[PDB]
């Protein structure tokens, strides 16, 4: 009967044997003010796109996995500038 605890969404969390009373006990609270890079649950939005197939490009390439080089290629954290607090993945349970 824990009607006064941290509801994640619909679930009450448990971290060190006891039910999470408030958000101040969670680890995410230490980085709750930084715009995080990725949020660990990763809910996909609207279905993923299908796998387009063709018999022209696969037959012409004869394998050779021609990879496109004009992509975005999301960079990493430069070794000199520490690791930005944003790089810590938020594990927003609720």
């Amino acid at each position: 009967g824990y009607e006064n605890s941290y509801d994640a969404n619909g679930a009450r969390l448990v971290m060190d044997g006891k039910v999470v009373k408030s958000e101040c006990q969670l680890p995410s609270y230490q980085i709750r003010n930084s715009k995080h890079h990725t949020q660990l649950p990763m809910r996909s939005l609207n279905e993923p796109p299908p796998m387009v197939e063709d018999l022209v490009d696969e037959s012409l390439f004869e394998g050779l996995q021609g990879y496109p080089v004009d992509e975005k290629l999301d960079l990493l954290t430069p070794p000199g500038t520490a690791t930005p607090s944003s790089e810590w993945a938020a594990i927003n349970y609720g």
Binding site: D7, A8, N9, G10, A11, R12, L13, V14, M15, V19, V20, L26, L40, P41, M42, R43, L45, N46, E47, I91, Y93
Partner: protein
């Protein structure tokens, strides 16, 4: 349109026996993409479920074994399935003489 609302007693709007004495001719659940009922579906899904703060991806609580069946209404909705398989391209070559093209019928 008339998107059903997953409630606390029927968190997935699956309409098992949940249509008794309340919306017997129940409308469809929700498309799960349009009208974002996914967050409220997961919020209804817990209602007193205790996660261990180690399962950060929300998968150890057997959420893969919970979903919405393709039919959430009282009928199997054979008219949509029938209009999905056939019925399209109205006015055939046999009836009105303008839709025929020198070849045979469609297949």
């Amino acid at each position: 349109k008339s998107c059903s609302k997953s409630s606390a007693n029927n968190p997935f709007s699956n309409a098992t026996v949940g249509a008794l004495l309340d919306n017997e001719a129940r409308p469809p659940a929700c498309s799960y993409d349009d009208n974002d009922m996914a967050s409220t579906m997961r919020k209804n899904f817990n209602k007193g479920l205790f996660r261990n703060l180690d399962d950060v991806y929300e998968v150890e609580n057997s959420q893969r074994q919970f979903y919405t069946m393709p039919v959430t209404t009282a009928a199997p909705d054979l008219t949509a399935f029938g209009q999905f398989l056939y019925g399209s391209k109205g006015k055939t070559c046999k009836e009105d003489p303008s839709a025929c093209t020198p070849a045979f019928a469609t297949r």
